[PDB]
Design a binder for these strands. Structure first.
Lengths: 135, 97, 77, 112, 100
RNA sequence: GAUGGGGAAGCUCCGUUUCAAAGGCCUGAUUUUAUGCAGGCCACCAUCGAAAGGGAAUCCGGUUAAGAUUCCGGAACCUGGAUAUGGAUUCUUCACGGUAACGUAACUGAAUGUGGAGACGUCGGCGCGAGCCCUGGGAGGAGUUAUCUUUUCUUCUUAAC
RNA sequence: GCUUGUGACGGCCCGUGAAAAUCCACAGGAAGGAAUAGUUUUCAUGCCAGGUCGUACUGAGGUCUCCAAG
């Protein structure tokens, strides 16, 4: 079964975001004219939302829940596919092949992605995805 | 014997050899049965077991080293992991092995 | 010693007011294999290191010596 | 055919006292004391010359920018990218073996 | 300036999105700047050849009206060879000509 | 080899972390019977011992009756310290590209944990570089020559950074 | 070719190959950071300073050591 799907969590293995968790928004099983290899389109999050205690208030809480995202075309060979899954429907039409290679379409991709991840972190759900992969 | 079961498939049906190609096959879901040698690295063994768990593939541990798996496929070199893309004239899937 | 292949950069250095003297060095060199020409070398004792300016052209040299601040002490060769 | 003397006070052929015979602009040969050569920084996990890091004297690393002392990944300036890869894989699967062991433990407790 | 330094002589950071295309006019001392916000800014730039005097750059007009199609503005801009007219090209499937 | 200890009538010897109270840092609205200091973090041990071991950074030309990597001219580099400006830190709050190895003018990172350099046996052949040696042409000078000899000798240099 | 420097290999061992000062790096996530100069200077440019002692010469059955033309 083709497990590498549109709602699939993965762990990036290589390059600047090594160790950082991602979600494959749109797979490309047999590549393209740019990227001639089985790759995936991902949108993961770089700066993890930091821990928040009852001592933190009003401004620190706003600072901790702030997440910084990233978008990258990544090879399957540098992906570790995970058993876990994540909702993706909010940003499927936002990231495509046209989204990549021509900014500032990447910028407005990053803003919708930033929104989606921050709105999902608040109202505490999918907590495993926003925890730091300890290695 | 397993050697009789495998050598038939290697002369009749579609197959693959080694780590990288088996993992590519698991990604495509075109793998049906994977064969893991005994002396394979623990990290690569765990990575194949987990990938097969994702793709929902039946897993067979070959009793003996990679040399004996190369001998089983009838090749001079050594092979750590063999997949079955297409099962041959043998009923290898429905059997215990 | 550091090469600057950059004209106005040298002129910025000359008006630093921490610079006392300058020097214009004249050379006799040949191109490719054919003909001899005349090379100039605009050198200032900078703040830390000496900056130098190879200008293979003679007209740009003719313009640059003219374009220097008149209060600055200029040295031939 | 000029013969060449040591320049510093050590008259001996130690590790520190290497000689390069260099021709000077006075038209004469003279010795130059060779600085002890810089080595590659190495993988703490691997034992291999890690790529993209400048090769300098230990003290000489203080002068140079951080982009010559670190590659951009996690464990960048200290590991291999292969040894980082291997510990991403390892820490993931160990963390998931913990889950499976909790599943088995919770099942056995329910059985008793 | 290829005479002044290796750094930029003047850094100007005004655009809202990615500065997609910047082009000189051939005859008149003018240059444009078409970013991804559907906006072209036109600049006057005097260059003084003989005298050791740094080039003056002044802004002129913010040209607008271009439609933004999925976070994408003006993909290209090219000047007319001999007069001060400018050819734009947006994501709105439409090229435009600007006039004095 | 002191210190703590323990011997010794003693001069002094044993011992080098030992059953030593061996000390140096952080937190705080000022510490609630009213202006008397509370809580925490870390657990080995002074020192001497190398002008051949490890070690930040200097070269060239010149100069005296006798001094030179020390003096002079020129040109450098290292280390420590205040601080000043430009640039960055993006619509305001710690930057991005590359599938990837990685790249960048920057791109905060405390306690604590770790890694690299320092930092390392000996030989063999092979590759590459520098100096020396051999040599062709050419630009100068000294020589020998009755004979033969485009002859013999010498100069033609390039430091740190 | 000689001198010397360096690179990749291959032998020789259960012989697995001084220490420390000093310098750098990673993991970590404490703290800090804006509306008459926010936080940060491992980016560029600019400023100042660097004490004591040795330093001459010789060094040739009879102490050690370096350079080495045809």
């Amino acid at each position: 079964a083709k497990f590498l799907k549109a709602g699939k969590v993965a762990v990036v293995v290589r390059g600047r975001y090594a160790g950082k968790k991602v979600v494959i928004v749109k797979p490309h099983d047999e590549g393209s004219k740019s990227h001639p290899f089985g790759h995936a389109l991902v949108a993961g999050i770089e700066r993890y939302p930091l821990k928040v205690t009852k001592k933190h208030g009003a401004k620190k809480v706003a600072k901790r829940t702030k997440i910084k995202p990233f978008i990258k075309v990544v090879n399957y060979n540098h992906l570790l596919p995970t058993r876990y899954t994540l909702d993706v429907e909010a940003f499927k039409s936002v990231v495509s092949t046209e989204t990549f290679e021509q900014p500032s379409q990447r910028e407005e991709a990053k803003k919708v992605v930033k929104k989606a991840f921050e709105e999902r972190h608040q109202a505490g759900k999918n907590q495993w995805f926003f925890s730091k992969l300890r290695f | 014997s397993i050697n009789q079961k495998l050598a038939l498939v290697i002369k009749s049906g579609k197959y693959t050899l080694g780590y990288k190609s088996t993992v590519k096959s698991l990604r495509q879901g075109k793998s049906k049965l994977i064969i893991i040698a005994a002396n394979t690295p623990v990290l690569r063994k765990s990575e194949l077991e987990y990938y097969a768990m994702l793709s929902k593939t039946k897993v067979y541990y070959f009793q003996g080293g990679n040399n004996e798996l190369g001998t089983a496929v009838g090749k001079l070199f050594r092979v750590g992991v063999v997949s079955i893309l297409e099962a041959g004239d043998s009923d290898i899937l429905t059997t215990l092995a | 010693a550091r090469e600057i292949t950059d004209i106005k950069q040298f002129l910025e250095l000359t008006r630093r007011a921490d610079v006392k003297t300058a020097t214009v060095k004249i050379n006799k060199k040949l191109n490719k294999a054919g003909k001899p020409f005349r090379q100039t070398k605009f050198k200032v004792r900078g703040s830390s290191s000496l900056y130098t300016l190879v200008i293979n052209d003679a007209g740009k040299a003719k313009k640059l010596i003219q374009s220097l601040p008149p209060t600055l002490k200029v040295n031939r060769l | 055919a000029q013969r060449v003397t040591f320049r510093r006070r050590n008259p001996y052929n130690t590790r520190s006292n290497k000689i390069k015979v260099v021709k000077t602009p006075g038209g004469i040969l003279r010795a130059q004391h060779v600085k002890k050569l810089a080595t590659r920084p190495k993988c703490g996990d691997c034992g291999s010359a890690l790529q993209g890091i400048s090769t300098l004297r230990p003290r000489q690393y203080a002068t140079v920018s951080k982009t010559h002392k670190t590659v951009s990944r996690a464990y960048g300036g200290s590991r291999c990218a292969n040894c980082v890869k291997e510990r991403i894989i390892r820490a993931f699967l160990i963390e998931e073996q913990k889950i499976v062991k909790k599943v088995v433990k919770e099942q056995t407790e329910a059985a008793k | 300036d290829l005479d002044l330094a290796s750094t930029p002589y003047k850094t100007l950071r005004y655009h809202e999105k990615a500065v997609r295309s910047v082009n000189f006019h051939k005859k008149l001392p003018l240059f444009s700047s078409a970013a991804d916000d559907g906006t072209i800014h036109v600049f006057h730039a005097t260059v003084y050849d003989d005298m050791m005097k740094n080039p003056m750059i002044v802004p002129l007009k913010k040209l607008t009206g271009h439609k933004v199609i999925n976070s994408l503005g003006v993909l290209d801009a090219i000047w007319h060879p001999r007069e001060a007219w400018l050819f734009s090209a947006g994501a709105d499937n439409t090229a435009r000509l600007w006039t004095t």
